[PDB]
Structure 1
Amino acid sequence: EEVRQFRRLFAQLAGDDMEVSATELMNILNKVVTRHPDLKTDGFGIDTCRSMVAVMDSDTTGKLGFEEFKYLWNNIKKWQAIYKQFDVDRSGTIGSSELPGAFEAAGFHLNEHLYSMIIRRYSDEGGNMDFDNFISCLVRLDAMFRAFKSLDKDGTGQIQVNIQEWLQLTMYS
């Protein structure tokens, strides 16, 4: 079974406490991208990894346990294929002309306005996007959709939060 197999790999990657900290995550992701020069990026920074751990830390332990890390990794490899798939110029980044497709391929159909804000927050001057940026953007977008669906219990397409819930959802991200 693939899951048991991953349990095994995970025991080698997890820290002393058998969860993966933001620093351990950063170190694993960087060793992996380093073997893939065709993926352009300045590296995954510690701030971005702390953010990714936070949005993925649904049981609020402070780090990624096996299930969380497996969920994350599966998305990363699924999204990393789309990346290589839309790097037509094989520039090592997704040109601005291919990003709308890329997001589409990952299953994201988003408004023209929200799309531009995301581009502003994650792309370069050229409007192109590198690897850690593409990946970190997707982990968050994915997490914010799930978060929204999880909070909309009655399924009305609208959620309600008080100041405490709002600060928790936005500061722990």
Structure 2
Amino acid sequence: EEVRQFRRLFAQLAGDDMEVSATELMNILNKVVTRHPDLKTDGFGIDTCRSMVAVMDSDTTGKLGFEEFKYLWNNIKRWQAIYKQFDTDRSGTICSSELPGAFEAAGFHLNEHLYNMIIRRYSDESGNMDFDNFISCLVRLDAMFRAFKSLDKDGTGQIQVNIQEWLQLTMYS
């Protein structure tokens, strides 16, 4: 019902090795955005998709199995509706004054310093963020929240990170 649609999409998408590569992901996402003329993008490029796959490849197989891919695709789905909803001037892009509302709608309450930092790294010189840049930021933000949580065993708001962990979390990303 729910997951018969989805079980099929995953099987067709993952193909012969039954996992979703960076390329397979790239291609489906560009296919989907083709159908939404209200999402401005210059396309999901390969290195952005390798980075989304790495940050979601928890068992480190190199590729996304069914659960990893399901988690990603349902997020992307929720986040696309948010992008459209908070693009309140229909630029096809999310600008600096739209960005807070959008992020907090996805459950990320950042502060001004952090918002500005995000815009500096993900938005263009006018301070606009296109759809691929938006999704790829969110995937990462979501992963880095969840890696913090996983490390904050005692719920102190402070984590201790050893150099091995640091290098794995930042490089396989």
TM-score by length of 1: 0.96
- Tell me if the contact between 1:82 and 1:106 (Cα under 8 Å) persists in the aligned partners: yes
For residue 104 of structure 2, give the secondary structure of its aligned residue in structure 1.
helix
Instruction: Give how far 1:15 is off.
Output: 3.0
- Tell me if the contact between 1:15 and 1:24 (Cα under 8 Å) persists in the aligned partners: no
C-alpha distance in 1 between matches for 2:76 and 2:158: 29
Output the aligned Cα RMSD.
1.1
Deviations along 1:35-74, whole A, 9 cap, x unmatched?
Answer: 1121100000111000000111111111111111111011
How many residues matched?
A: 173
- Tell me if the contact between 1:15 and 1:21 (Cα under 8 Å) persists in the aligned partners: no
C-alpha distance in 2 between matches for 1:161 and 1:85: 37
In the alignment, structure 1 segments of 5+ residues that lack a partner are: none
Instruction: Give how far 1:160 is off.
Output: 1.4
Aligned to 1:30: 30
Percent identity, aligned pairs only?
Answer: 97
- Tell me if the contact between 1:96 and 1:126 (Cα under 8 Å) persists in the aligned partners: no
C-alpha distance in 2 between matches for 1:172 and 1:55: 6
For residue 42 of structure 1, give the secondary structure of its aligned residue in structure 2.
coil
C-alpha distance in 1 between matches for 2:161 and 2:107: 27
Instruction: Give how far 1:3 is off.
Output: 2.4
Q: After TM superposition, where is structure 1 displaced by more than 2 Å over at least 4 residues in a row?
A: none
C-alpha distance in 1 between matches for 2:166 and 2:95: 35
C-alpha distance in 1 between matches for 2:39 and 2:111: 27
In the alignment, structure 2 segments of 5+ residues that lack a partner are: none
Deviations along 1:55-97, whole A, 9 cap, x unmatched?
Answer: 1111111111111111101110100001110111111111222
TM-score by length of 2: 0.96
Instruction: Give how far 1:98 is off.
Output: 1.1
For residue 14 of structure 1, give the secondary structure of its aligned residue in structure 2.
helix
C-alpha distance in 2 between matches for 1:97 and 1:111: 13
Instruction: Give how far 1:23 is off.
Output: 0.9
Deviations along 1:98-123, whole A, 9 cap, x unmatched?
Answer: 11111111111002111111110001
